[PDB]
């Protein structure tokens, strides 16, 4: 007879207020694809237009979701992820998709296939405002392998809602996106009504066709000359995972992961052995040969990057010390904050920070082309359509109307100039 705690639509915006840097939100979506329960080999991050709305899409070839799991995904706090075979999930909080999606945009859709069923889930602020819902309701439609509807009462209602307020006004429009997941299994997230300033999206898509970028008015708040990761998604994605297990493709051009050995000089190794731990922590110290001026400590958690270029020790003290010095450490014993762009500020974090600086000081005193685009030809119309990198294999015959890319899905659409 006790009452359930309730979620108000307004909360969807509230939950997103941790992310002050848009990329932190993007990162969450990436993590979820990366994580071992999904196990995607590849994720495609794209900018596209649907129904006259700019959209960001995140598509992966991972395991997909049951209808119920999708509900949990659209629910707050449910996470049950476990390490597999040494693959450790990043996610424990259960909030990342919500926090991220909503940070990026007002409305979001999820299409998933686990190979037995496909389901579609709607998480929209706009939908909620319009129907003036007092609670957060997440419509869901689920189908059998044969494209037949099931769990009908929910789906029937859910579907009616999606068509009316969703980007996709027809059953056909919806199924197209489901199709864009080429494999039997996988997921596609579409986000629209992106944040706009100056009557344009916060993101700049035009400066670089192959990147998602933050326009210059750009340095992060903490920073004072800005490294690439701050304004370039591609640059950021390179360093996102310490030992990558997944391939990230942005705007159709795959992202090549940076390597220390090819990135740093006079590499040396140090050990962290604090009293509060039963294990050693390895550290790598290097000199930055490349841009002189991005240097500091990169702190990784569960193989994932939390903060970079943290300045420690002498580097803190003055203009002139430690420049070009980079450190790499993974701290699994620390706890990430709400946006996973920092750690909880605890005695342990403080100690670790202090040790890194002392250690860094010791080190300092001691020492002293894009890949090719690929196209496919439509069998029906003979037009050439651009293809993203990372596809393992193609069907024998390919038609403009089976194109994952939303903008070139019918033969009637002009072929796109090459560069």
């Amino acid at each position: 007879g006790i009452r359930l705690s309730a979620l108000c639509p307004k909360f969807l915006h509230t939950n997103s207020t941790s992310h002050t840097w848009p990329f932190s939100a993007v990162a969450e979506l990436i993590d979820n694809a990366y994580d071992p329960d999904v196990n995607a080999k590849q994720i495609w991050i794209d900018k596209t237009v649907i129904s006259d709305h700019i959209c960001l899409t995140f598509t992966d070839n991972g395991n997909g979701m049951t209808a119920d799991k999708l509900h949990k995904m659209l629910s707050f706090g449910f996470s049950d992820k476990v390490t597999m075979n040494g693959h450790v999930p990043v996610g424990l909080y259960g909030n990342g998709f919500k926090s991220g999606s909503m940070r990026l945009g007002k409305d979001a859709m999820v299409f998933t296939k686990n190979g037995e069923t496909m389901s579609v889930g709607f998480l929209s602020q706009t939908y909620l405002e319009v129907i003036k819902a007092e609670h957060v309701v997440v419509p869901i439609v689920t189908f059998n392998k044969h494209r037949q509807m099931i769990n009908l009462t929910e789906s029937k209602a859910s579907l009616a809602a999606i068509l009316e307020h969703s980007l996709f006004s027809t059953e056909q429009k919806l199924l197209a996106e489901l199709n864009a997941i080429m494999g039997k299994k996988g997921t596609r997230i579409i986000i629209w009504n992106l944040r706009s300033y100056k009557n344009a999206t916060e993101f700049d898509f035009e400066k670089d066709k192959y990147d998602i970028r933050i326009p210059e008015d750009y340095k992060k708040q903490e920073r004072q000359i800005a490294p690439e990761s701050d304004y370039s998604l591609r640059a950021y994605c390179s360093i996102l995972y310490l030992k990558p297990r997944m391939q990230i493709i942005i705007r159709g051009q795959k992202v090549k992961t940076q390597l220390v050995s090819k990135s740093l000089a006079y590499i040396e190794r140090d050990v962290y052995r604090p009293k509060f731990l039963t294990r050693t922590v390895r550290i790598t110290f290097g000199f930055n040969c490349r841009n002189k001026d991005h240097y500091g400590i990169m702190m990784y958690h569960k193989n994932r990057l939390i903060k970079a270029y943290e300045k420690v020790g002498c580097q803190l003290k003055a203009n002139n010390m430690g420049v070009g010095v980079v450190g790499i450490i993974e701290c699994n014993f620390l706890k990430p904050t709400h946006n996973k762009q920092d750690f909880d500020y605890t005695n342990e974090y403080r100690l670790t920070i202090l040790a890194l600086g002392e250690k860094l000081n010791d080190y300092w005193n001691e020492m002293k082309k894009r890949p090719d685009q690929t196209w496919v030809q439509c069998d029906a119309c003979l037009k050439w359509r651009k293809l993203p990198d990372g596809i393992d294999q193609l069907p024998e015959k390919w038609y403009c109307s089976n194109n994952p890319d939303p903008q070139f899905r019918n033969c009637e659409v002009p072929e796109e100039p090459e560069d």
Partner: peptide, 10 residues
């Protein structure tokens, strides 16, 4: 199916 290649330009 048929597939070209091209150079992407920075």
């Amino acid at each position: 199916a048929r597939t070209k290649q091209t150079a992407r330009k920075s």
